[PDB]
């Protein structure tokens, strides 16, 4: 039980270090103060063109494309954040290297949607590391197939953010997603599930000591893993339609090499 | 706590009352126990066509097998419907909500209970008196050949938890009482009923499986594997309705597929 506190704090610390924009920092920005500087708001086409001028995005080499490709940049950015984090989970580095890769290959989408929930409200999502805020309505207004890209993630974020999880809770949750013993292609599932049994224990205790008035929060949190998986499925189906019916490229074939799987 | 033991006992009795073929019965048939009579195995044609003699058909071949397979499915929708009414609070909800909860829950319940009738080599049929092999089903002409295999793949993973009926009774309740279903008017009274069911399920597993860590959590993550075979199955329904348009889908099952 103290061992489990050690694990929960350890992961909280790794999560702080590995991820720039935490849920507290992001919640702050999304709702009035802490009133340092408001974010640039993109709400419509014209506010976008000024947003590229002002904020200055790292991914600028249409329009519904250019945003789609910002997500990809940021996703690939995030994957390295997630990989460094995975390496701090007790036992992860000592697993077979083939298993490590597999776990990350399948975990990362699910983890990206989880931490994206942290950056969203009902009305939009923080971009450029907190400097910006793109409206939900604007994203739903983009043409097919791009109008329906972001919406399944907002629908999710609304339900997930209602659980009112802290970063100390998310940190453990993230480690549980990564260590799923049912990913296709794993060679040695035993030690994976051992580690996950420990993370789940720690999550259940964390969840009790931190939210003792919210009954069965543990069970409700594990039920959202269903909703996570269904978003990765709805998203693979969309990448299908893009690679099928879009000149989603030109390209530097060296770019689409970077942004494949 | 005592009240959760009480809810658990109540739901177990409604399970036994509403389902003719329990897991425990299934398991006794599948092994070699003297409590139950060994099944007639069907592993190809002639075995099928000799199984016509030792019974039954339902009450071409891939058509005749899958038409009856749907008949047993309506019956199961009836058995599940009757079980659901026993769950404290369910019948007190909005009527619209009662149907929504069944519309999305039945498939998840059917495939959970179908696991009880299965091991890796095949599946119990005709109330336990036949057994049809996995390879035989897999040899059937496409698209029906690939119909049963996801079910087998889930079942083998799920039967690994070694749950028994007193555990399934509660779990099946939790499935039906999910507040995250499309088109529900008042989620909140549903979420409260589910909150009790999980509390009850938690205790039930800790008492009935004291040596197996995080079975509460391992079990709940299997709902992700169920949702997946439901979505895989409607994809396959679309294809069946176009290739073999000679085949009738029962209206109760018509209404359920619109999601
Ligand atoms: C991390 C992330 C964020 C912050 N957003 C919102 C968002 C919305 C719009 C823009 Cl222009 C954007 O980029 C800006 C410039 C930024 O954050 O700096 C970000 C996202 C929007 C969508 C996604 C997303 O769906 N990523 C999926 C999981 C994804 C897609 C494709 C890949 C591969 C590797 C296959 C290319 C991985 C992951 C991820 C994110
Ligand atoms: C409850 C159930 C059982 C016990 N099985 C195994 C099985 C396999 C084969 C037969 Cl012939 C069978 O029926 C016998 C006669 C019986 O009475 O038990 C049952 C099943 C196999 C499949 C399914 C299932 O997926 N049913 C869905 C609702 C379904 C949808 C659509 C169709 C068609 C092909 C008609 C479009 C069938 C079934 C359900 C079951």
Coordinates of C-alpha atoms and ligand atoms in Angstrom, one line a residue:
Chain A
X1 CA 0.0 0.0 0.0
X2 CA 3.0 2.3 0.6
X3 CA 4.8 0.6 -2.3
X4 CA 1.7 1.6 -4.4
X5 CA 2.0 5.2 -3.2
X6 CA 5.6 5.1 -4.3
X7 CA 4.5 3.9 -7.7
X8 CA 1.8 6.5 -8.0
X9 CA 4.2 9.4 -7.2
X10 CA 6.9 8.0 -9.4
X11 CA 4.6 8.1 -12.3
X12 CA 3.2 11.5 -11.5
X13 CA 6.8 12.8 -11.5
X14 CA 7.6 11.1 -14.9
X15 CA 4.4 12.4 -16.3
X16 CA 5.1 16.0 -15.2
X17 CA 8.7 15.7 -16.6
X18 CA 7.7 14.0 -19.9
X19 CA 4.7 16.1 -20.8
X20 CA 4.9 19.8 -21.3
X21 CA 1.3 20.9 -21.0
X22 CA -0.3 19.2 -18.0
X23 CA -4.1 19.1 -17.2
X24 CA -3.8 21.8 -14.5
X25 CA -2.0 24.2 -16.7
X26 CA -4.4 23.4 -19.5
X27 CA -7.5 23.8 -17.3
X28 CA -6.2 27.1 -16.1
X29 CA -5.9 28.4 -19.6
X30 CA -9.3 27.1 -20.6
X31 CA -11.3 29.0 -17.9
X32 CA -10.5 32.6 -17.2
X33 CA -7.4 33.1 -14.9
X34 CA -4.6 32.2 -14.0
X35 CA -4.7 35.3 -16.2
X36 CA -1.2 35.6 -17.6
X37 CA -2.1 35.8 -21.4
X38 CA -5.2 34.7 -23.2
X39 CA -4.9 32.3 -26.2
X40 CA -5.2 33.3 -29.8
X41 CA -8.6 32.0 -30.9
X42 CA -9.2 30.4 -34.3
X43 CA -13.0 30.5 -34.9
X44 CA -13.3 30.9 -38.7
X45 CA -11.2 30.9 -41.8
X46 CA -9.9 34.4 -41.5
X47 CA -8.7 34.0 -37.8
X48 CA -6.7 31.0 -39.1
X49 CA -4.6 33.0 -41.6
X50 CA -3.7 35.5 -38.9
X51 CA -3.0 32.6 -36.5
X52 CA -0.3 31.3 -38.8
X53 CA 1.2 34.8 -39.1
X54 CA 1.2 35.5 -35.3
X55 CA 1.7 32.2 -33.4
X56 CA 4.1 30.8 -36.1
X57 CA 3.5 27.0 -36.5
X58 CA 6.6 24.7 -36.8
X59 CA 4.8 22.4 -39.4
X60 CA 4.2 25.0 -42.2
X61 CA 6.2 23.6 -45.2
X62 CA -5.8 23.0 -49.0
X63 CA -6.6 24.5 -45.5
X64 CA -8.6 21.5 -44.3
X65 CA -5.4 19.6 -45.3
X66 CA -3.0 22.0 -43.6
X67 CA -4.8 21.5 -40.3
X68 CA -4.9 17.7 -40.7
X69 CA -1.2 17.8 -41.2
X70 CA -0.7 19.9 -38.1
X71 CA -2.3 17.2 -36.0
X72 CA 0.0 14.6 -37.5
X73 CA 3.1 16.7 -36.7
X74 CA 1.9 17.2 -33.2
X75 CA 1.0 13.5 -32.9
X76 CA 4.5 12.4 -33.9
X77 CA 5.9 15.0 -31.5
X78 CA 3.7 13.5 -28.8
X79 CA 4.8 9.9 -29.5
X80 CA 8.3 10.7 -28.3
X81 CA 6.9 12.3 -25.2
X82 CA 4.9 9.1 -24.6
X83 CA 8.0 6.8 -25.3
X84 CA 10.2 8.6 -22.8
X85 CA 7.3 8.2 -20.3
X86 CA 6.9 4.5 -21.0
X87 CA 10.5 4.0 -20.2
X88 CA 10.0 5.3 -16.6
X89 CA 7.2 2.7 -15.9
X90 CA 8.8 0.1 -13.5
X91 CA 9.5 -3.1 -15.6
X92 CA 8.9 -1.7 -19.0
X93 CA 12.6 -1.4 -20.0
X94 CA 13.3 -4.9 -18.7
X95 CA 10.7 -6.4 -21.1
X96 CA 11.7 -7.9 -24.5
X97 CA 12.5 -5.1 -27.0
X98 CA 10.0 -6.5 -29.5
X99 CA 7.2 -6.3 -26.9
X100 CA 8.1 -2.7 -25.9
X101 CA 7.7 -1.6 -29.6
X102 CA 4.4 -3.5 -30.0
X103 CA 2.9 -2.0 -26.8
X104 CA 3.9 1.5 -28.0
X105 CA 2.7 0.8 -31.6
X106 CA -0.9 0.1 -30.3
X107 CA -1.0 2.3 -27.2
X108 CA -0.1 5.6 -28.6
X109 CA -3.4 6.5 -30.3
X110 CA -5.3 5.6 -27.2
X111 CA -2.9 7.7 -25.1
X112 CA -3.0 10.6 -27.5
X113 CA -6.8 10.7 -27.3
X114 CA -6.7 10.5 -23.5
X115 CA -4.3 13.5 -23.2
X116 CA -6.2 15.3 -25.9
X117 CA -9.2 15.1 -23.6
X118 CA -7.1 17.2 -21.1
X119 CA -6.8 19.9 -23.8
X120 CA -10.5 20.1 -24.8
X121 CA -13.8 21.5 -23.6
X122 CA -17.2 21.5 -25.1
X123 CA -16.3 24.4 -27.3
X124 CA -12.8 23.7 -28.6
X125 CA -9.2 22.5 -28.1
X126 CA -5.9 24.1 -27.0
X127 CA -3.3 24.2 -29.8
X128 CA 0.4 25.3 -30.2
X129 CA 1.3 24.1 -26.7
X130 CA -1.4 26.3 -25.0
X131 CA -0.8 29.5 -27.1
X132 CA -4.0 28.9 -29.2
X133 CA -7.5 27.5 -29.1
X134 CA -9.3 26.2 -32.1
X135 CA -13.0 26.1 -32.0
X136 CA -15.0 22.9 -32.2
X137 CA -17.6 24.6 -34.4
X138 CA -14.9 25.7 -36.9
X139 CA -13.5 22.0 -37.1
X140 CA -17.1 20.6 -37.6
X141 CA -17.4 23.3 -40.4
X142 CA -14.5 21.9 -42.5
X143 CA -15.4 19.9 -45.6
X144 CA -15.9 16.2 -45.8
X145 CA -14.2 14.0 -44.9
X146 CA -12.4 16.5 -42.6
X147 CA -15.5 17.9 -40.8
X148 CA -16.1 14.6 -39.0
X149 CA -12.4 14.0 -38.1
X150 CA -12.3 15.8 -34.7
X151 CA -15.9 15.3 -33.6
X152 CA -15.6 11.7 -32.1
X153 CA -12.8 13.0 -30.0
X154 CA -14.9 16.0 -28.6
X155 CA -17.8 13.6 -27.9
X156 CA -15.3 11.5 -25.9
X157 CA -13.6 14.4 -24.1
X158 CA -17.0 15.6 -22.8
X159 CA -17.7 12.3 -21.1
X160 CA -14.1 11.7 -20.0
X161 CA -13.5 15.2 -18.5
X162 CA -16.7 14.7 -16.4
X163 CA -14.8 12.2 -14.3
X164 CA -12.7 15.2 -13.2
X165 CA -9.5 13.3 -13.1
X166 CA -6.3 15.0 -11.8
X167 CA -2.9 14.6 -13.4
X168 CA -1.9 12.1 -10.6
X169 CA -4.8 9.9 -11.7
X170 CA -4.0 10.3 -15.5
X171 CA -0.4 9.4 -15.1
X172 CA -1.4 6.0 -13.7
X173 CA -4.1 5.5 -16.2
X174 CA -1.7 6.2 -19.1
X175 CA 0.7 3.4 -17.8
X176 CA -2.3 1.0 -17.7
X177 CA -3.2 1.7 -21.4
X178 CA 0.4 1.0 -22.4
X179 CA 0.7 -2.3 -20.7
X180 CA -2.3 -4.0 -22.3
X181 CA -1.5 -7.8 -22.7
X182 CA -3.9 -8.3 -25.6
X183 CA -2.0 -6.4 -28.3
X184 CA -1.5 -8.6 -31.3
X185 CA 2.1 -9.8 -31.7
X186 CA 3.4 -10.0 -28.1
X187 CA 5.8 -12.8 -27.3
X188 CA 5.8 -12.7 -23.4
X189 CA 2.5 -11.5 -22.0
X190 CA 3.1 -12.8 -18.4
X191 CA 5.4 -9.9 -17.2
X192 CA 3.2 -7.3 -19.0
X193 CA 0.1 -8.4 -17.1
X194 CA 2.1 -8.5 -13.8
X195 CA 3.1 -4.9 -14.2
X196 CA -0.4 -4.0 -15.3
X197 CA -1.8 -5.8 -12.2
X198 CA 0.4 -3.5 -10.1
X199 CA -0.6 -0.3 -12.0
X200 CA -4.3 -1.2 -11.6
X201 CA -3.8 -1.7 -7.8
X202 CA -2.1 1.6 -7.6
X203 CA -4.7 3.3 -9.7
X204 CA -7.5 1.9 -7.5
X205 CA -5.8 3.2 -4.3
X206 CA -4.9 6.5 -5.9
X207 CA -8.5 6.9 -7.0
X208 CA -9.8 6.3 -3.5
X209 CA -7.5 8.6 -1.6
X210 CA -8.0 11.4 -4.1
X211 CA -11.8 11.1 -5.0
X212 CA -13.4 9.2 -2.1
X213 CA -16.9 10.7 -2.7
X214 CA -17.1 9.5 -6.4
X215 CA -18.2 5.9 -6.0
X216 CA -16.8 3.3 -8.3
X217 CA -14.7 5.8 -10.3
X218 CA -12.2 3.0 -11.0
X219 CA -14.9 0.9 -12.7
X220 CA -16.2 4.0 -14.7
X221 CA -12.6 4.8 -15.8
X222 CA -11.9 1.3 -17.1
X223 CA -15.2 1.5 -19.0
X224 CA -13.9 4.4 -21.0
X225 CA -11.2 2.2 -22.5
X226 CA -14.0 0.9 -24.6
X227 CA -14.7 4.4 -25.9
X228 CA -10.9 4.9 -26.5
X229 CA -10.6 1.8 -28.7
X230 CA -13.7 2.7 -30.8
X231 CA -12.2 6.1 -31.6
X232 CA -8.9 4.5 -32.9
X233 CA -11.2 2.2 -35.1
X234 CA -13.3 5.2 -36.3
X235 CA -10.0 7.0 -37.0
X236 CA -8.3 4.1 -39.0
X237 CA -11.5 4.1 -41.2
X238 CA -11.0 7.8 -41.9
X239 CA -7.3 7.5 -42.8
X240 CA -8.6 4.9 -45.3
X241 CA -10.8 7.5 -47.0
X242 CA -8.0 10.1 -47.1
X243 CA -5.3 7.9 -48.6
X244 CA -8.1 6.5 -50.9
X245 CA -9.7 9.7 -52.2
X246 CA -7.3 12.6 -51.4
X247 CA -4.3 14.2 -53.1
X248 CA -3.2 14.5 -49.4
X249 CA 0.3 15.1 -50.6
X250 CA 2.5 16.3 -53.5
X251 CA 5.0 15.5 -51.9
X252 CA 8.4 15.5 -50.4
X253 CA 8.3 11.7 -50.3
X254 CA 10.7 12.2 -47.4
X255 CA 7.8 13.9 -45.5
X256 CA 5.2 11.1 -45.9
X257 CA 8.0 8.8 -44.9
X258 CA 8.2 10.6 -41.6
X259 CA 4.3 10.6 -41.2
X260 CA 3.5 7.0 -42.1
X261 CA 2.7 4.6 -39.1
Chain B
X1 CA -22.1 -4.7 2.0
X2 CA -24.6 -7.2 3.3
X3 CA -27.0 -5.4 0.9
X4 CA -24.6 -6.1 -1.9
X5 CA -24.4 -9.8 -1.0
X6 CA -28.3 -9.6 -1.1
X7 CA -28.4 -8.0 -4.6
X8 CA -25.9 -10.7 -5.8
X9 CA -28.1 -13.5 -4.4
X10 CA -31.2 -11.9 -6.0
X11 CA -29.7 -11.6 -9.5
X12 CA -28.2 -15.1 -9.4
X13 CA -31.7 -16.5 -8.9
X14 CA -33.1 -14.4 -11.8
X15 CA -30.3 -15.8 -14.0
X16 CA -31.2 -19.4 -13.1
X17 CA -34.9 -18.5 -13.5
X18 CA -34.5 -16.9 -16.9
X19 CA -31.8 -19.1 -18.6
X20 CA -32.4 -22.8 -19.3
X21 CA -28.7 -23.6 -20.1
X22 CA -26.3 -22.3 -17.4
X23 CA -22.5 -22.3 -17.6
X24 CA -22.3 -25.0 -14.9
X25 CA -24.6 -27.2 -17.0
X26 CA -22.6 -26.4 -20.1
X27 CA -19.3 -27.2 -18.4
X28 CA -20.6 -30.6 -17.2
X29 CA -21.7 -31.6 -20.7
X30 CA -18.4 -30.4 -22.2
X31 CA -16.1 -32.4 -19.9
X32 CA -17.5 -35.9 -19.0
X33 CA -19.6 -35.4 -15.9
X34 CA -22.3 -37.9 -14.8
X35 CA -24.7 -35.0 -14.0
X36 CA -25.1 -34.6 -17.8
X37 CA -25.4 -36.7 -21.0
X38 CA -22.6 -36.5 -23.6
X39 CA -23.4 -34.6 -26.8
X40 CA -23.7 -35.8 -30.4
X41 CA -20.7 -34.2 -32.2
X42 CA -21.2 -32.6 -35.7
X43 CA -17.9 -32.3 -37.6
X44 CA -18.9 -32.4 -41.3
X45 CA -21.7 -33.5 -43.6
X46 CA -23.2 -36.9 -42.8
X47 CA -22.4 -36.1 -39.2
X48 CA -24.7 -33.1 -39.9
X49 CA -27.0 -35.2 -42.0
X50 CA -27.0 -37.9 -39.2
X51 CA -27.5 -35.2 -36.6
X52 CA -30.9 -34.6 -38.3
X53 CA -31.8 -38.0 -36.9
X54 CA -30.6 -37.4 -33.3
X55 CA -32.1 -33.8 -33.6
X56 CA -32.5 -30.8 -34.4
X57 CA -32.7 -28.4 -37.4
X58 CA -33.6 -25.0 -35.8
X59 CA -36.5 -25.5 -33.3
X60 CA -29.1 -25.5 -48.5
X61 CA -26.8 -26.1 -45.5
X62 CA -25.1 -22.9 -44.3
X63 CA -28.5 -21.3 -44.8
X64 CA -30.3 -24.0 -42.8
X65 CA -27.7 -23.8 -40.0
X66 CA -27.7 -20.0 -39.8
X67 CA -31.5 -19.6 -40.0
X68 CA -31.8 -21.7 -36.9
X69 CA -28.9 -19.9 -35.2
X70 CA -31.1 -16.8 -35.5
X71 CA -34.1 -18.5 -34.0
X72 CA -32.0 -19.4 -31.0
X73 CA -31.0 -15.8 -30.9
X74 CA -34.5 -14.4 -30.7
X75 CA -35.2 -16.9 -27.9
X76 CA -32.1 -15.5 -26.1
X77 CA -33.4 -11.9 -26.7
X78 CA -36.5 -13.1 -24.9
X79 CA -34.6 -14.7 -22.0
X80 CA -32.4 -11.6 -21.6
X81 CA -35.4 -9.2 -21.8
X82 CA -37.0 -11.3 -18.9
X83 CA -33.8 -11.2 -16.9
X84 CA -33.4 -7.4 -17.3
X85 CA -36.8 -6.8 -15.7
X86 CA -35.5 -8.5 -12.6
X87 CA -32.7 -5.9 -12.2
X88 CA -33.7 -3.5 -9.4
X89 CA -34.8 -0.2 -11.0
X90 CA -34.7 -1.2 -14.6
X91 CA -38.5 -1.3 -15.0
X92 CA -38.8 2.0 -13.1
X93 CA -36.9 3.8 -15.9
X94 CA -38.3 5.7 -18.9
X95 CA -39.8 3.2 -21.3
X96 CA -37.8 4.7 -24.2
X97 CA -34.7 4.1 -22.2
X98 CA -35.7 0.5 -21.4
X99 CA -35.7 -0.3 -25.1
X100 CA -32.4 1.7 -25.8
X101 CA -30.6 -0.3 -23.1
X102 CA -31.8 -3.6 -24.6
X103 CA -31.2 -2.6 -28.2
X104 CA -27.4 -2.1 -27.5
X105 CA -27.0 -4.6 -24.7
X106 CA -28.5 -7.9 -26.1
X107 CA -25.6 -8.6 -28.5
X108 CA -23.1 -8.0 -25.8
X109 CA -25.1 -10.4 -23.5
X110 CA -25.6 -13.1 -26.2
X111 CA -21.9 -13.3 -27.0
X112 CA -20.9 -13.4 -23.3
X113 CA -23.3 -16.3 -22.8
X114 CA -22.3 -18.0 -26.0
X115 CA -18.8 -18.2 -24.5
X116 CA -20.2 -20.4 -21.7
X117 CA -21.4 -22.9 -24.4
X118 CA -18.0 -23.0 -26.1
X119 CA -14.4 -24.2 -25.8
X120 CA -11.7 -23.9 -28.4
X121 CA -12.8 -27.0 -30.3
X122 CA -16.5 -26.0 -30.8
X123 CA -19.9 -25.0 -29.5
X124 CA -22.9 -26.5 -27.8
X125 CA -26.2 -26.6 -29.8
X126 CA -29.8 -27.8 -29.5
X127 CA -29.9 -27.1 -25.7
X128 CA -26.7 -29.0 -25.0
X129 CA -27.5 -32.2 -26.9
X130 CA -25.4 -31.4 -30.0
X131 CA -21.9 -30.0 -30.4
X132 CA -20.8 -28.4 -33.6
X133 CA -17.1 -28.1 -34.3
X134 CA -15.2 -24.9 -35.0
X135 CA -13.4 -26.3 -38.1
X136 CA -16.8 -27.5 -39.5
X137 CA -18.2 -24.0 -39.2
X138 CA -15.1 -22.5 -40.6
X139 CA -15.3 -24.8 -43.6
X140 CA -18.8 -23.4 -44.5
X141 CA -19.1 -21.4 -47.8
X142 CA -18.3 -17.7 -47.5
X143 CA -19.6 -15.4 -46.2
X144 CA -20.9 -17.8 -43.4
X145 CA -17.6 -19.5 -43.0
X146 CA -16.0 -16.6 -41.1
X147 CA -19.1 -15.8 -39.0
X148 CA -18.3 -17.8 -35.9
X149 CA -14.6 -17.4 -35.6
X150 CA -14.4 -14.0 -33.8
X151 CA -16.9 -15.5 -31.3
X152 CA -14.5 -18.4 -30.7
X153 CA -11.5 -16.0 -30.4
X154 CA -13.3 -14.0 -27.8
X155 CA -14.7 -17.0 -26.0
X156 CA -11.3 -18.7 -25.4
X157 CA -9.9 -15.4 -24.0
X158 CA -13.0 -14.9 -21.9
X159 CA -13.4 -18.4 -20.5
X160 CA -9.8 -18.0 -19.3
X161 CA -11.2 -15.8 -16.5
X162 CA -12.9 -19.0 -15.1
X163 CA -16.1 -17.1 -14.2
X164 CA -19.1 -19.0 -12.9
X165 CA -22.8 -18.2 -13.1
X166 CA -23.0 -16.2 -9.9
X167 CA -20.3 -13.9 -11.4
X168 CA -22.0 -13.7 -14.9
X169 CA -25.4 -12.8 -13.5
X170 CA -24.0 -9.6 -12.1
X171 CA -21.7 -8.9 -15.1
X172 CA -24.5 -9.3 -17.5
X173 CA -26.5 -6.8 -15.5
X174 CA -23.6 -4.3 -15.7
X175 CA -23.6 -4.6 -19.5
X176 CA -27.3 -3.7 -19.8
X177 CA -27.1 -0.8 -17.4
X178 CA -24.6 1.3 -19.2
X179 CA -25.2 5.0 -19.0
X180 CA -22.9 5.6 -22.1
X181 CA -25.5 4.3 -24.7
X182 CA -26.6 6.3 -27.8
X183 CA -30.0 8.1 -27.4
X184 CA -30.7 7.9 -23.7
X185 CA -33.0 10.6 -22.2
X186 CA -32.0 10.5 -18.4
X187 CA -28.6 8.8 -18.1
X188 CA -28.3 9.6 -14.3
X189 CA -30.8 7.1 -12.8
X190 CA -29.1 4.5 -15.0
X191 CA -25.6 5.4 -13.8
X192 CA -26.8 5.0 -10.2
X193 CA -28.2 1.5 -10.9
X194 CA -24.9 0.6 -12.6
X195 CA -22.9 2.0 -9.7
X196 CA -24.6 -0.6 -7.4
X197 CA -24.0 -3.4 -9.8
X198 CA -20.3 -2.7 -10.0
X199 CA -20.0 -2.4 -6.3
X200 CA -21.8 -5.8 -6.1
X201 CA -19.7 -7.3 -8.8
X202 CA -16.5 -6.1 -7.1
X203 CA -17.4 -7.8 -3.8
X204 CA -18.7 -10.9 -5.5
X205 CA -15.3 -11.5 -7.3
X206 CA -13.2 -10.7 -4.3
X207 CA -15.2 -13.3 -2.3
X208 CA -15.7 -16.0 -5.0
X209 CA -12.2 -15.6 -6.6
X210 CA -10.0 -14.5 -3.7
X211 CA -6.7 -15.7 -5.2
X212 CA -6.9 -13.9 -8.6
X213 CA -5.6 -10.3 -8.7
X214 CA -7.5 -7.5 -10.4
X215 CA -10.2 -9.8 -11.9
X216 CA -12.6 -7.0 -11.4
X217 CA -10.4 -4.9 -13.7
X218 CA -9.5 -7.7 -16.2
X219 CA -13.2 -8.5 -16.6
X220 CA -14.2 -4.9 -17.2
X221 CA -11.5 -4.5 -20.0
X222 CA -13.2 -7.5 -21.8
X223 CA -16.2 -5.2 -22.6
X224 CA -13.8 -3.6 -25.2
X225 CA -13.4 -7.1 -26.8
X226 CA -17.2 -7.6 -26.9
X227 CA -17.9 -4.2 -28.5
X228 CA -15.3 -5.1 -31.1
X229 CA -17.1 -8.4 -32.1
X230 CA -20.4 -6.6 -32.2
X231 CA -19.0 -4.1 -34.8
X232 CA -17.3 -6.9 -36.7
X233 CA -20.7 -8.8 -36.8
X234 CA -22.8 -5.8 -38.1
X235 CA -20.1 -5.4 -40.9
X236 CA -20.7 -9.0 -41.8
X237 CA -24.5 -8.6 -41.6
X238 CA -24.3 -5.9 -44.3
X239 CA -22.6 -8.4 -46.7
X240 CA -25.0 -11.3 -46.0
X241 CA -28.1 -9.1 -46.7
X242 CA -26.6 -8.3 -50.1
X243 CA -25.1 -11.6 -51.3
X244 CA -27.8 -14.0 -50.1
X245 CA -30.9 -11.9 -50.3
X246 CA -33.0 -15.1 -50.2
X247 CA -32.5 -15.3 -46.4
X248 CA -34.9 -13.8 -43.8
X249 CA -33.8 -11.7 -40.8
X250 CA -36.4 -11.8 -37.9
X251 CA -38.0 -8.4 -37.2
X252 CA -37.0 -8.3 -33.6
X253 CA -33.4 -8.6 -34.8
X254 CA -34.2 -6.1 -37.7
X255 CA -35.1 -3.5 -35.1
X256 CA -31.9 -4.1 -33.0
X257 CA -29.6 -3.3 -36.0
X258 CA -29.9 0.5 -36.6
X259 CA -26.9 2.0 -34.8
Ligands
LIG1 C1 -1.9 16.1 -30.0 C2 -3.0 16.7 -30.8 C3 -3.4 18.0 -30.7 C4 -2.8 19.0 -29.8 N1 -4.5 18.1 -31.5 C5 -5.3 19.4 -31.8 C6 -4.9 20.1 -32.9 C7 -5.8 20.6 -33.8 C8 -5.4 21.4 -34.9 C9 -4.0 21.6 -35.1 CL1 -3.4 22.6 -36.5 C10 -3.1 21.1 -34.2 O1 -1.7 21.4 -34.4 C11 -1.3 22.6 -33.7 C12 -0.4 23.4 -34.6 C13 -0.5 22.3 -32.3 O2 -1.0 21.6 -31.4 O3 0.6 22.9 -32.2 C14 -3.5 20.4 -33.1 C15 -4.7 17.0 -32.1 C16 -5.7 16.7 -33.0 C17 -5.7 15.4 -33.5 C18 -4.8 14.4 -33.1 C19 -5.0 13.1 -33.6 O4 -6.1 12.7 -34.0 N2 -3.9 12.3 -33.7 C20 -4.0 10.9 -34.2 C21 -4.2 10.1 -32.9 C22 -2.9 10.5 -35.0 C23 -3.0 10.6 -36.4 C24 -2.0 10.1 -37.2 C25 -0.9 9.5 -36.7 C26 0.2 9.0 -37.6 C27 1.5 8.7 -36.8 C28 -0.4 7.7 -38.3 C29 0.5 10.0 -38.7 C30 -0.8 9.4 -35.3 C31 -1.8 9.9 -34.5 C32 -3.9 14.8 -32.1 C33 -3.8 16.1 -31.7
LIG2 C1 -27.3 -18.0 -29.0 C2 -26.4 -18.6 -30.1 C3 -26.0 -19.9 -30.1 C4 -26.3 -21.0 -29.1 N1 -25.2 -20.1 -31.2 C5 -24.5 -21.3 -31.6 C6 -25.2 -22.0 -32.5 C7 -24.6 -22.6 -33.7 C8 -25.3 -23.3 -34.6 C9 -26.7 -23.5 -34.5 CL1 -27.7 -24.4 -35.6 C10 -27.4 -23.0 -33.3 O1 -28.7 -23.3 -33.2 C11 -29.2 -24.5 -32.6 C12 -30.2 -25.3 -33.5 C13 -29.8 -24.2 -31.2 O2 -31.0 -24.2 -31.1 O3 -29.0 -24.1 -30.2 C14 -26.6 -22.3 -32.4 C15 -25.1 -18.9 -31.8 C16 -24.5 -18.5 -32.9 C17 -24.5 -17.2 -33.4 C18 -25.3 -16.3 -32.7 C19 -25.4 -15.0 -33.3 O4 -24.4 -14.4 -33.7 N2 -26.7 -14.5 -33.5 C20 -27.0 -13.3 -34.3 C21 -28.1 -12.5 -33.6 C22 -27.3 -13.5 -35.6 C23 -27.5 -12.5 -36.5 C24 -27.8 -12.7 -37.9 C25 -28.0 -14.0 -38.4 C26 -28.3 -14.3 -39.8 C27 -27.2 -15.3 -40.4 C28 -29.7 -15.0 -39.8 C29 -28.3 -13.0 -40.6 C30 -27.8 -15.0 -37.5 C31 -27.5 -14.8 -36.1 C32 -26.0 -16.7 -31.6 C33 -25.9 -18.0 -31.1

